[PDB]
């Protein structure tokens, strides 16, 4: 909304790039450790983006064998980078949590 | 079927080295495990038939280690293969160590505790091993160290003169060191077997940190080949230093035989030990020193619960790739700093390497990570 | 970390410290006799067996 | 102080000829297995 | 032209594990004298005349 | 052997399979080969005959595999070509 | 006991000779030249650097 506001967007394209995991053609959530919360969220997912996110893994790991990046245009885009599980990981955390509260009483 | 999956004692050797599945991405970082199994029996075999020839008493314990060298047939190959192995051992356990933070390989608690139970156990057998050719560092390094022990307050002193079997190191601080440094790599061994128990249950880590069962391959041939071109690169570096150097890591000191009255000006321990000698000598305080001085190992046993990145390996975390770096060229300093004297201006260099140490590991690399997850914002 | 504040959580600890306190005791009163502890044990009336 | 000076270096001398020899053979070895996964293509085939 | 060494190598010696390791235990018999002489002969060669070898001579009786 | 001329003989029974087996022989063969000479090149075989035309084309050689379906457990292409010999012979 | 008596276990005698001859020798000249016994390899052309 700001000129300000593009500047952590710009760090965050920064470290983003920097991060580098876009050169393997993964995406964020491709990445995160997998504890309880993300194994249930990973099994929740539909069909089609469980087999995309098997593939890219296989191909990133694939890659990470050789040494080797993708070419600069396949990438991931940081613009167009999907966070395909947080909404199925922001739900499983909020169920464990109503778990933890009636656990309490 | 077949034989090598239904036999109960095949089974297990099937089941580990051979049909195992591996990720297919592990790099030469992970090649340091067998080259620890190596190096361990490297040591047992070099340490067994040092034992045909060696006494464990004080007037013929600095002369039988002579007469190895000179007389029995080979000798002087075998022992300094068993006094460079011992820092090949721990040139691998570093580099094991290392992998395991880096990679995150630490989220494993039972094998990485009992991790840090085969380092303490590794370095109390090689201080033992130091002891029995009872040289000048032999004996005034076994002294200021096992005095470290009465600085714990109210049971210290008793403590100290239990180990020493008397009121200093003396003859039967010799002969016990040498039946310790005998029973403990056996104990080591079995725990290295319930360090691979634990291990199985779950697979290797790969460099990515992301879970490889989507891309598995089997042990053999792929890392059955690769572990025997790594033992191939240890034998390189072994016999390099047995060959060609094989007084470089050594003190001089320990060709003089033992003297209670006259102390060698610098008492310096082996370069695996100068690290943890730094921090011991830049706390004023004696028992404050052994404090530090075990918490400078013990907290490896805290790296999982001080984990805060989403993430779990540092392949895609740079602001913490900087700070693991900053902890080995950290660690670099407190080795060349335990290897000088306590003067002007290595003693304030060995406390400001000391406090960056415990630093780095409970305070800024744990906050790196949690910057790290607000810049992917989750 | 702070799941475990709430008034179940509270309940089982009052539930369990007359048990704790008494393993407290096994392992006190245990360390003093495998030792022979002398600052504690010379304070009872039948082990006064010492003679100093 | 060292008798063994002599026979030490001979023993080098043939250590590195053979690690010349058996490095890069052995080398060959590992490449020769692990090029059935170095060169191996893969092919991502949904439904639509 | 007949098929190359390494063709008549295998079907001849290699073919068979039997004969693949006989050839591998010969081929070490021949390999340790072979090595072994040429590679004192460096060792020495290096060190000319400063071997007791090369200085037995002078105190022959 | 058995097999082999029963599987012939049965094949051969009936007016389509054999104006195939004539087709299809002329085109390879550019002959029909008799059933009498396929005897007598069956009785030919014999133990040798398998173990010198089985390693000719078996013992040692890189294999073409296909595998489709749930395939996880399928051996790695180098455990398959180590089962192309034994370390025993 | 007598179950491997007949035409098929004679057969497997034959196929495994030619295989079994081999393995002896590769286990013969493998114990000549790990303990380098010298009744055997003196006889050898080139292995004779013995110098008696
Ligand atoms: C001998 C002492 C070795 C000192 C450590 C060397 C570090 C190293 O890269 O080891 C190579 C080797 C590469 O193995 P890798 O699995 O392909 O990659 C490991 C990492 O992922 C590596 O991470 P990376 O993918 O970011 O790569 C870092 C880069 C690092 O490369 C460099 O910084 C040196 C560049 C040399 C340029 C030529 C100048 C001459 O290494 C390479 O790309 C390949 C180096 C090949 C050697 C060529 C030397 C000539 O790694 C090791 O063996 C680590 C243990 C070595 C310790 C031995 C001490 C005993
Ligand atoms: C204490 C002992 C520690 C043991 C460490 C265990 C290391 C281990 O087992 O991993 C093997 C692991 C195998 O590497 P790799 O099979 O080539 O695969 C590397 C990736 O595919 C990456 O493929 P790439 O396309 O990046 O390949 C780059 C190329 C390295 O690039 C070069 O060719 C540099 C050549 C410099 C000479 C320049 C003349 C012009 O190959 C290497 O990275 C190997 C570096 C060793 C070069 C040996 C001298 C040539 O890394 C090594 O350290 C191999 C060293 C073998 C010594 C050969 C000496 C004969
Ligand atoms: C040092 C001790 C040496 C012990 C030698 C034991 C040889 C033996 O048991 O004969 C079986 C073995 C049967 O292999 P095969 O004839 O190919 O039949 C495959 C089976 O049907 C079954 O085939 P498979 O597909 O179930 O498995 C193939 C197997 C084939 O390799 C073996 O089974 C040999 C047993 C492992 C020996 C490990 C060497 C130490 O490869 C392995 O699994 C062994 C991998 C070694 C992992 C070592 C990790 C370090 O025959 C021999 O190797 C005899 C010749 C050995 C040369 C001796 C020199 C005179
Ligand atoms: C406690 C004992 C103290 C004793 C002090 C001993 C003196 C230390 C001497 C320093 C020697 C340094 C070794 C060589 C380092 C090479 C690093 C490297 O090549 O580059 C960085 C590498 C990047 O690789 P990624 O996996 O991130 O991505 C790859 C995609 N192509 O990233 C990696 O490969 C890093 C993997 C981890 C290596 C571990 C080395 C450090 C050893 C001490 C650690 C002790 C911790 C308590
Ligand atoms: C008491 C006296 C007894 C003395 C006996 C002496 C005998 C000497 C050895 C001879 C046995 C050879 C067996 C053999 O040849 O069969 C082993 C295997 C085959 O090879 P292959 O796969 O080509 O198949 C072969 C396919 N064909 C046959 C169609 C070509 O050989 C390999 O694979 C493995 C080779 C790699 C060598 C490194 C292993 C050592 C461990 C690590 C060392 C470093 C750190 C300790
Ligand atoms: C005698 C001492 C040790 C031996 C022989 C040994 C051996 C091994 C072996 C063979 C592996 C599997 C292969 C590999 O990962 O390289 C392994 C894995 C591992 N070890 Fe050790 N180890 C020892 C001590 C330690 C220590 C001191 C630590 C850390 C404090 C440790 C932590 C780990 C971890 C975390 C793994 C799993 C690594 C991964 O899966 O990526 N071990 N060890
Ligand atoms: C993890 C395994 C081992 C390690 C790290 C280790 C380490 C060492 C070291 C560094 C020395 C000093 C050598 C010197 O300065 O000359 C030593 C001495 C000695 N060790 Fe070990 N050792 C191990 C296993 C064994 C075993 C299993 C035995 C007995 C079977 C043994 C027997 C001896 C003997 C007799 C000496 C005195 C001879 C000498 O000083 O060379 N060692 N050990
Ligand atoms: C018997 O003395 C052995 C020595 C050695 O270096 O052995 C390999 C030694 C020599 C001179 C001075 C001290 C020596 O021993 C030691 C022992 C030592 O042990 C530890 C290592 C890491 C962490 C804590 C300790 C302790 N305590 N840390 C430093 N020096
Ligand atoms: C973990 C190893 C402990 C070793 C203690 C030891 O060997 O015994 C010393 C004293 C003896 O009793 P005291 O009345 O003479 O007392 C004399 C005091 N020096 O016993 C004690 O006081 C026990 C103290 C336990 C603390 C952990
Ligand atoms: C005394 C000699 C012992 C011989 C045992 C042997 O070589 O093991 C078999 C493999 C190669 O054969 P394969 O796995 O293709 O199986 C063929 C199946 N037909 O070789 C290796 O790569 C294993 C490494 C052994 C390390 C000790
Ligand atoms: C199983 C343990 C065998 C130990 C034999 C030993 O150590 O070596 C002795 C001889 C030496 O060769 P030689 O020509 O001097 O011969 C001198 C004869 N004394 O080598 C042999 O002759 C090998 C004999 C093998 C028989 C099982």
Request: with cysteine.
């Amino acid at each position: 909304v700001s000129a300000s506001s593009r500047w952590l967007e710009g760090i965050r394209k920064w470290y983003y790039n920097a991060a580098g995991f876009n050169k393997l053609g993964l995406m964020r959530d491709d990445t995160i450790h997998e504890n309880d919360d993300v194994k249930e969220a990973i099994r929740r997912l539909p069909e089609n983006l469980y087999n995309d996110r098997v593939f890219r893994i296989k191909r990133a790991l694939d890659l990470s064998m050789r040494q080797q990046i993708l070419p600069k245009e396949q990438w991931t885009k940081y613009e167009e980078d999907k966070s395909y599980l947080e909404p199925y990981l922001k739900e499983v955390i909020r169920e464990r949590k109503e778990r933890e509260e009636w656990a309490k009483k | 079927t077949n034989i090598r999956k239904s036999h109960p004692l095949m089974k297990i050797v099937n089941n580990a080295f051979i049909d195992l599945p591996a990720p297919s991405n592990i790099s030469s970082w992970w090649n340091f495990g067998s080259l620890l199994g190596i190096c361990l029996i490297l040591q047992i075999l070099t340490g067994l038939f040092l034992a045909m020839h060696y006494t464990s008493d004080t007037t013929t314990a600095f002369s039988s280690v002579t007469h190895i060298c000179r007389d029995v047939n080979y000798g002087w190959i075998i022992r300094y293969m068993h006094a460079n192995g011992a820092s090949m051992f721990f040139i691998c356990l570093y580099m094991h160590v290392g992998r395991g933070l880096y990679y995150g390989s630490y989220t494993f608690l039972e094998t990485w505790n009992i991790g840090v139970i085969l380092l303490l156990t590794v370095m109390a057998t090689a201080f033992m091993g130091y002891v029995l050719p009872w040289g000048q560092m032999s004996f005034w390094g076994a002294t200021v160290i096992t005095n470290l022990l009465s600085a714990i307050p109210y049971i210290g002193t008793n403590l100290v003169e239990w180990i020493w079997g008397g009121f200093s190191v003396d003859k039967a601080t010799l002969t016990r060191f040498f039946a310790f440094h005998f029973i403990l790599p056996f104990i080591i061994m079995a725990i290295a077997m319930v360090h691979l128990l634990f291990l199985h249950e779950t697979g290797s880590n790969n460099p990515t940190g992301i879970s490889s069962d989507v891309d598995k391959i089997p042990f053999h041939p792929y890392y059955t080949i690769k572990d025997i071109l790594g033992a191939l690169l240890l034998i390189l570096a072994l016999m390099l230093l047995v060959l060609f150097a094989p007084d470089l890591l050594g003190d001089p000191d320990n060709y003089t035989p033992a003297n209670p009255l006259n102390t060698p000006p610098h008492i310096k321990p082996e370069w695996y030990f100068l690290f943890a000698y730094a921090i011991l000598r830049s706390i004023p305080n004696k028992l404050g020193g052994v404090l530090a001085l075990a918490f400078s190992i013990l907290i490896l046993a805290l790296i999982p619960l001080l984990h805060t990145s989403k993430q779990r390996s540092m392949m895609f975390r740079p602001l913490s790739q900087c700070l693991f770096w900053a902890l080995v060229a950290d660690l670099l300093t407190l080795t060349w700093i335990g290897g000088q004297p306590v003067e002007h201006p290595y003693i304030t260099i060995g406390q400001l390497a000391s406090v960056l140490y415990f630093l780095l590991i409970l305070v800024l690399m744990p906050t790196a990570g949690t910057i790290e997850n607000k810049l992917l914002k989750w | 970390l702070t799941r475990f504040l709430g008034p179940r959580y509270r309940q089982l600890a009052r539930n369990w410290v007359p048990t704790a306190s008494l393993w407290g005791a096994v392992g006190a009163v245990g360390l003093v006799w495998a030792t022979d502890w002398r600052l504690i044990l010379d304070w009872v009336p039948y082990i006064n067996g010492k003679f100093k | 102080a060292e008798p063994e000076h002599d026979h030490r270096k001979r023993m080098g001398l043939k250590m590195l000829l053979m690690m010349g020899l058996l490095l890069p053979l052995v080398y060959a070895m590992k490449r020769h297995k692990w090029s059935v996964l170095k060169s191996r293509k893969l092919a991502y085939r949904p439904p639509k | 032209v007949a098929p190359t060494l390494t063709a008549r190598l295998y079907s001849l010696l290699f073919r068979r594990t039997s004969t693949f390791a006989l050839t591998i235990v010969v081929g070490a018999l021949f390999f340790e004298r072979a090595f072994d002489q040429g590679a004192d002969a460096i060792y020495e060669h290096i060190n000319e005349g400063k071997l007791w070898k090369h200085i037995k001579h002078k105190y022959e009786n | 052997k058995n097999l082999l001329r029963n599987a012939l003989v049965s094949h051969l029974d009936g007016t389509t399979p054999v104006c195939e087996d004539i087709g299809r022989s002329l085109l390879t063969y550019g002959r029909r080969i008799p059933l009498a000479e396929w005897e007598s090149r069956i009785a030919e075989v014999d133990a040798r005959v398998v173990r010198e035309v089985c390693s000719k084309y078996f013992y040692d050689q890189c294999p073409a595999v296909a595998g489709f379906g749930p395939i996880e457990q399928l051996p790695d292409y180098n455990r398959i070509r180590s089962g192309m010999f034994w370390l025993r012979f």
